[PDB]
């Protein structure tokens, strides 16, 4: 239609800027990264946003609300993703044997 | 901290079906997920392989967790060579 073609345009053309993530990663490493790191790390974070919004619209469709996304559907989105191990936290030393 | 992903993330939520005008407190949440996702995939990436940040260990975490992050990183590494072959 005429909205699906506009939505497909924003699904492909949108990206995080490489001039800021290379500034953001290098503040964590200390020295330097490469261009093929920033190209991949800018691409995984678009999949991760698409992992949340496609699942936060499943929270909103499950409850009785409309397309505008309140934060109620966004804290619930991170809760359901973390229970399936999708959201990694490297500060919680987990233990499976008890 | 200011918001470094305020205008970029509004295009992306529209790209996955949200609205043309998302709420400010919803982009407040998604901007903090991405900064933690890049932090909790760099803090764990500087212990694997070596104490640097080569991209041969960024591709390790994407398998056995979610195959969409792996099938969309093999496309960005293949298309880097088909966009330098055209020049």
């Amino acid at each position: 239609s005429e909205e699906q073609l506009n939505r497909y345009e924003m699904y492909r053309r949108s990206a995080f800027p490489k001039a800021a993530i290379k500034r953001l990663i290098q503040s964590i490493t200390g020295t330097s990264v490469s261009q093929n790191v920033v190209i991949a790390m800018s691409g995984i974070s678009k999949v991760f946003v698409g992992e949340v919004v496609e699942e936060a619209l499943d929270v909103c469709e499950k409850w009785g609300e409309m397309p505008p996304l309140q934060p109620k559907h966004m804290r619930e989105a991170v809760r359901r993703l973390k229970s399936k191990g999708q959201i990694p936290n490297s500060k919680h030393k987990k233990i499976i044997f008890f | 901290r200011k918001r470094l992903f305020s205008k970029e993330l509004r295009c992306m939520m529209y790209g996955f079906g949200d609205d043309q005008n998302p709420y400010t407190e919803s982009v407040d949440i998604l901007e903090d997920l991405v900064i933690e996702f890049i932090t909790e995939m760099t803090h764990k990436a500087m212990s694997i392989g070596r104490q640097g940040r080569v991209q041969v260990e960024d591709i390790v975490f994407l398998i056995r967790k979610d195959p969409r992050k792996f099938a969309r990183v093999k496309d960005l590494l293949t298309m880097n060579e088909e966009l330098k072959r055209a020049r």
Binding site: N6, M10, R13, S14, P68, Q70, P71 | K7, E8, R10, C11, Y14, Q20, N21, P22, Y23, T24, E25, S26
Partner: peptide, 26 residues
Amino acid sequence: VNLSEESARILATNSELVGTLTRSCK
């Protein structure tokens, strides 16, 4: 020179269509 000016035109239309009014929520 063609790659330098056309890169910012994919993002310039990404500030005219999406996000016209800024909302909030209780």
